[PDB]
Ligand binder design. Structure first.
Ligand code: ATP
Ligand code: ATP
Ligand code: MG
Ligand code: MG
Ligand code: ZN
Lengths: 48, 226, 534
RNA sequence: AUUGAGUGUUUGUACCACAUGUACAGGAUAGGUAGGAGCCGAUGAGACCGGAACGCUAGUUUCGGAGGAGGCGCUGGUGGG
């Protein structure tokens, strides 16, 4: 079951990214280091 | 159910009538037929139930005319501050180590205070002062840097109050021998401090009942809007 | 207690989907559901430990007394008194309050305002939880369940499963709560102890939610029954007892089944006519016309046709021994054992099993039942005597506390054996209701009931001829218990079993019962009740 | 809504009477808080006898009989109280 997800910034809570994952292959929330345009810095981003 | 004196006193009280403060206090001067200078009590039935932490109510008020009975002040002081308590008129002032003498001695005294950091030492005796109600609580004003003010206020007749877990608060406002004018002034002061002490999370009508009573006489309902 | 639009999905397997429930105050709600249904998860939502992915879960401001399904032993050396005392926040606040006094001396005129407020609240909070409890707890043990004071100074980890359950239940009561959330409060209790719990819960004036797989226990207490559905991922709340819930539920599923039947007939009818028109000659214009018109109705029917929920599959157990039992599977002769520093549990214990025999080790809580079984396996070395297993006897052990699983590893990793290939392991786990990627889940996230199935699967995969089972039906849903008992009855091997569940022992059909602590090898009969009375 | 009287039964609510409060220790059945050194009694006290209720089985409470004057508390130790 491949699904669309949003990656929220764990610092400022801005929903910065649209991406997708297969829930069967990635049960847990996808976490990535992505640039936050608000904070203008790379921050941990987590699926919300 | 009651003796003739209480029955006779009952005939002078209407059960269903809410009296004004002026009438109730004057009537209390006739329902205090007990064979001594009885105290006058005021009981408010606040709607707050102290089971909730934010609903708890506790403190003290310096009654303007006092209760007419001396209070024995015990002061825990450090350095020259102890002599300040004696100058202020503390009944007896104890060092850090005098807690041992208080343990098993010097009982039958009214209040304790810390100035203010002495509580690090008073904590050892707290289990003795705690259940007896003598533990210095900052909320009641027994702990303060202004020990000079704390001592003299207590001699002026500061009376503590605390809502019981049932939802009642009782306070002695003065002796039955007091003039009604002085007695009324004390009663009004109690009313103001409680309203000021209303918890921010209270809902609905605050004072669900006010009753005046003597040490032996019946309770007399009074109007909080009067 | 109220929940709206509840949603919760751990990875790919979901628990609640648009679920709702409203519980009125002063309702003794009995929570029922198969293992994994999500009964424990509901409490975690109430305790705010978990957060719903979507929806709102509403809880009253009153203090909640929570009895966990698993005992929480923070450190192995914790004493029973320390464990119980942790129920009340008296100790925690004093440690904070003691530090506050230290800060007051260090800080003169900077933080006094903040410190004074914190000190005042702690004193007021401490008095609200009256510090006289030190004496009340000591006597709460006596009046509650006859908990001896010798246990009071003993490490909690060393207590028996039944004893631990008493302590945990007492701890909840010690906290003086306003709402009771009991998660299997009688998991290991014996018959006598269950009586006290039932009476207290009957008398308890406040709201009490009970998660239990004991139908008889619930029926005596429950006035409202909440069923957590495993297939619909929803919550339904009934008024009445367990039987009433079963009656109402069975009827509803019957009435739903009949609805789906009639909707299928109408779809088949249209389908049958559409096909008849489809295969008619192209020259029959009117029939071809009618065929297309009915094709439109057929499409609209197939799009409003309710799907029948897939009935939750029940466990299938086929336990068979590889080898054959002997006339003397196990020889115990003059075996004495005592835990260092405690009275001897039994002296010169000597028994002999016969083979393909149902051997019940009877007793009460904290009497040595689990110690005896641990003795046979080799966990405990006998202080005196000998224990001899015939070379023909293979032994499978089901421990009481589920101590045979690696919480860190997955389900498949736990069951990995040198004698079984991958597809063989998956097939059996599917028979135990672990389907597809449900076997890659860590054992640490499973419920106690689901873990019990993994332990049972390990026992089954051994294909041993002697089964040492210590309370097997514990943590299992009522349906799985009956399956367990029925299949064991047909087991062609020797069974040494311990069980406080009267129903389970009846299904197995015990032959000889061994009473404790008074060693009495006896033929099984309703005289078991006589021993229980005496 | 027009549409008004009742009775009875079952229920929700609020007063009003009554009664209930036994953890362990402890004079022994201290429910919470405050006041309290005084309180009650030929407006017939204690003790005694009998009926009744509760009951954790220890005792507690109440009614009546006879009798006629005395009792309880503070002080005292126990206890978180
Ligand atoms: N490791 C241990 N160390 C010290 N004492 C122990 C230990 N294990 C058990 N005991 C004591 O042995 C006694 C009985 O042992 P056991 O664990 O077999 O009880 P049980 O028969 O399983 O009772 P139940 O299962 O119903 O709770 C208990 O009182 C327990 O306190
Ligand atoms: N962190 C998690 N990750 C993956 N799955 C989880 C997680 N937590 C719970 N689950 C699953 O949630 C499901 C239901 O939750 P829960 O443990 O509350 O069931 P239960 O009804 O209480 O079990 P039982 O009645 O047997 O005690 C479990 O099957 C469990 O496998
Ligand atoms: Mg559970
Ligand atoms: Mg056991
Ligand atoms: Zn950010």
């Amino acid at each position: 079951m491949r699904v669309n997800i949003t990656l929220e910034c764990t610092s400022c809570k801005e929903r910065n990214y649209l991406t997708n994952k297969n829930k069967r292959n990635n049960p847990d929330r996808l976490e990535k280091q992505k640039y936050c345009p608000r904070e203008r810095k790379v921050t941990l981003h987590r699926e919300t | 159910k009651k003796s003739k004196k209480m029955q006779e006193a009952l005939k002078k009280v209407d059960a269903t009538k809410a009296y004004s403060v002026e009438e109730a206090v004057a009537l209390a001067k006739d329902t205090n037929i007990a064979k001594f200078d009885a105290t006058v009590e005021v009981a408010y039935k606040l709607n707050v139930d102290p089971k909730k932490a934010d609903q708890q109510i506790r403190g003290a008020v310096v009654l303007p005319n006092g209760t007419g009975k001396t209070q024995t002040v015990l002061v825990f002081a450090k350095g020259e501050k102890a002599k300040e308590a004696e100058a202020a008129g503390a009944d007896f002032v104890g060092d850090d180590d005098m807690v041992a003498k208080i343990q098993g001695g010097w009982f039958d005294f009214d209040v304790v205070v810390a100035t203010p950091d002495m509580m690090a030492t008073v904590g050892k005796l707290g289990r003795v002062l705690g259940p007896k109600g003598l533990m210095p609580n900052p909320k009641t004003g027994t702990v303060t840097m202004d020990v000079t003010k704390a001592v003299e206020e207590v001699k002026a007749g500061k009376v503590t109050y605390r809502v019981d877990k049932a939802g009642n608060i009782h306070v002695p406002i003065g002796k039955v021998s007091f003039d009604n004018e002085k007695l009324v002034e004390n009663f009004n002061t109690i009313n103001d401090v409680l309203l000021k002490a209303k918890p921010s999370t209270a809902k609905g009508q605050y004072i669900k009942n006010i009753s005046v009573t003597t040490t032996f006489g019946p309770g007399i309902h009074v109007d909080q809007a009067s | 207690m109220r929940g709206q639009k509840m949603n919760l999905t751990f990875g790919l397997e979901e628990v609640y989907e648009d679920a709702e429930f409203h519980l009125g105050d002063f309702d003794k709600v009995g929570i029922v559901g198969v293992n994994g249904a999500g009964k424990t998860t509901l409490f975690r939502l109430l305790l705010r430990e978990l957060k719903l992915d979507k929806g709102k879960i509403t809880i009253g401001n009153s203090r909640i007394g929570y009895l966990p399904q698993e005992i929480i032993i923070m450190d192995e050396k914790m004493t029973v008194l320390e464990f119980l005392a942790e129920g009340r926040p008296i100790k925690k606040m004093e440690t904070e309050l003691n530090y506050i006094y230290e800060k007051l001396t260090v800080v003169d005129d900077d933080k006094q305002d903040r410190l004074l407020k914190r000190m005042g609240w702690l004193q007021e909070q401490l008095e609200y939880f009256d510090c006289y409890e030190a004496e009340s707890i000591l006597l709460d043990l006596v009046d509650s369940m006859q908990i001896d004071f010798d246990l009071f100074d003993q490490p909690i980890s060393e207590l028996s499963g039944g004893q631990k359950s008493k302590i945990s239940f007492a701890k909840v009561l010690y906290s003086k709560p306003e709402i009771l959330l009991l998660d299997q409060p009688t998991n290991h209790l014996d018959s006598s102890t269950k009586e006290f719990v039932t009476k207290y819960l009957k008398s308890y004036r406040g709201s009490v939610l009970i998660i239990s797989h004991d139908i008889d226990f619930l029926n005596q207490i429950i006035d409202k029954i909440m069923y957590i559905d495993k297939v619909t991922h929803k919550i339904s709340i009934y008024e009445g007892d367990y039987y009433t819930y079963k009656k109402k539920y069975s009827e509803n599923q019957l009435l739903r089944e009949k609805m789906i039947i009639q909707q299928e007939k109408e779809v088949k009818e249209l389908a049958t006519f559409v096909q008849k028109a489809k295969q008619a000659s192209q020259t029959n214009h009117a029939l071809k016309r009618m065929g297309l018109e009915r094709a439109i109705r057929l499409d609209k029917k197939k799009k409003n046709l309710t799907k029948r929920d897939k009935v939750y599959k029940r466990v299938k157990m086929d336990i068979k021994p590889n080898r054959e039992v002997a006339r003397t599977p196990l020889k115990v002769e003059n075996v004495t054992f005592h835990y260092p520093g405690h009275p001897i549990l039994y002296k010169d214990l000597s028994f002999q099993i016969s083979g393909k025999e149902r051997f019940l080790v009877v007793g009460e809580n904290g009497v040595g039942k689990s110690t005896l079984l641990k003795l046979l396996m080799g966990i405990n070395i006998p202080d005196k005597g000998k224990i001899i297993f015939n070379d023909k006897t293979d032994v499978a052990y089901y421990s009481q506390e589920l101590e045979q699983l690696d919480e860190e590893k997955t389900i498949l990793e736990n069951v990995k054996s040198d004698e079984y290939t991958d597809w063989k392991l998956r097939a059996t786990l599917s028979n135990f209701l672990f389907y597809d990627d449900d076997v890659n889940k860590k054992v640490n996230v499973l419920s106690p009931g689901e873990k019990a199935r993994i332990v049972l699967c390990k026992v089954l995969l051994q294909k041993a001829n002697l089964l040492i089972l210590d309370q097997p039906t514990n943590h299992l849903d009522p349906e799985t218990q009956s399956i367990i008992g029925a299949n064991f009855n047909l087991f062609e091997g020797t069974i040494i079993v311990v069980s406080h569940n009267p129903s389970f022992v009846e299904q197995i059909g015990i032959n000889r019962m061994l009473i404790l602590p008074s060693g009495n090898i006896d033929n099984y009969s309703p005289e078991l009740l006589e021993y229980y009375s005496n």
